[PDB]
């Protein structure tokens, strides 16, 4: 069953692996060709416990939302975590309550639990963005609000111009991928109350020989996967929670138990030292 972790300092659990859903729906552009597959197979993630829901409204061009907004219909809404995010081309205040608005239109919800700023864009002032984000809070539309792919220094930043609380920073984060360690990331959220949202937690599967024949003896000792010993290494750490894709019932249900085992301090040790 499903690990559950804080969320910043809401005193608010949530499921520690979210449902990550880049590619449900489309890419870059819509794809209505597996619609109902699509619906069935959120459905039965729900249903498994994945509550914890990540989307965005580059996903699918729109359509990844719509997917979900059919999708939740089955289930009770306040029992749902649903994550969205405003592309770099929307940080204006006007663009980004519209991309709100069209988000839960494509929804069909009243709210997000949690906004993402998705990317940064240089161009457009953060306290102008994070205004709009917390006019959005103000009017019910959102619940929290947090940034992604956002480093340390432009989180810090992010923290002094938001007039509501910061609660996660959603990065790149993996075995092999340890820039949110070498950038004093993971080490400031634990000690200011931010929770760092893993993506890609299994690189995509994409990993060396070195990585592997280490993931592989401690699997072995687990009666594991490697990419379970990946996820629960990362939710090994406090303030961590992953965002895995699982697009078949086999990796939901193979990622869900991978937050049952537990790690070893000379394991954690040794997976340390791989980045
Ligand atoms: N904020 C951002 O900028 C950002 C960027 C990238 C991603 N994300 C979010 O993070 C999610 C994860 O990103 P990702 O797709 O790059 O990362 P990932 O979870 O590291 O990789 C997904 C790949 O791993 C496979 N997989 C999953 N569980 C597995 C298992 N137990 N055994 C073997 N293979 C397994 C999947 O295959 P199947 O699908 O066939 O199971 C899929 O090909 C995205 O959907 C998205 O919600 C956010
Ligand atoms: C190909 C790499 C991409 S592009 C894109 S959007 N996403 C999902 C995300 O960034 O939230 C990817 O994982």
């Keep these: 069953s499903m690990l559950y972790k804080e969320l910043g300092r809401t005193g608010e659990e949530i499921p520690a692996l979210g449902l990550g859903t880049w590619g449900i729906g489309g890419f870059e552009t819509p794809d209505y060709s597996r619609d109902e597959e699509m619906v069935e197979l959120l459905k039965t993630a729900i249903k498994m416990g994945y509550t914890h829901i990540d989307t965005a409204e ?3 061009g729109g359509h990844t939302e719509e997917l979900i907004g059919k999708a ?3 289930f009770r809404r306040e029992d749902l975590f649903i994550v969205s995010k405003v592309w770099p081309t929307h940080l204006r ?3 980004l309550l519209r991309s709100l608005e069209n988000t839960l239109k494509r929804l069909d919800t009243d709210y997000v639990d949690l906004y993402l700023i998705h990317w940064p864009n240089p161009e457009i002032p953060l306290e102008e963005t994070l205004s709009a984000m917390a006019e959005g809070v103000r009017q019910g539309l959102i619940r929290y609000i947090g940034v992604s792919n956002f480093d340390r220094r432009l989180l810090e930043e992010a923290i002094s111009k938001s007039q509501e609380p910061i609660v996660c920073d959603q990065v790149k984060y993996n075995i092999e991928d340890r820039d949110p ?11 200011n109350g931010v929770t760092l949202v893993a993506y890609s937690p299994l690189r995509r599967t994409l990993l060396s020989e070195k990585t592997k024949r280490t993931l592989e ?6 009666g594991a996967t490697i990419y379970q010993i990946m996820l629960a290494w990362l939710l090994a750490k406090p303030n961590v929670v992953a965002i895995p894709k699982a697009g078949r019932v086999e990796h939901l249900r193979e990622n869900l138990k991978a937050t049952e085992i537990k790690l070893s301090e000379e394991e954690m040790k040794l997976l340390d030292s791989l980045g």
């Design 58 to 60: 580059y996903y699918g």
């Design 72 to 74: 939740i219909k089955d």
């Design 93 to 95: 205040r006007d663009d």
């Design 181 to 191: 360690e070498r950038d004093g990331l993971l080490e400031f959220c634990q000690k």
């Design 217 to 222: 003896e401690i699997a072995k000792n687990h």
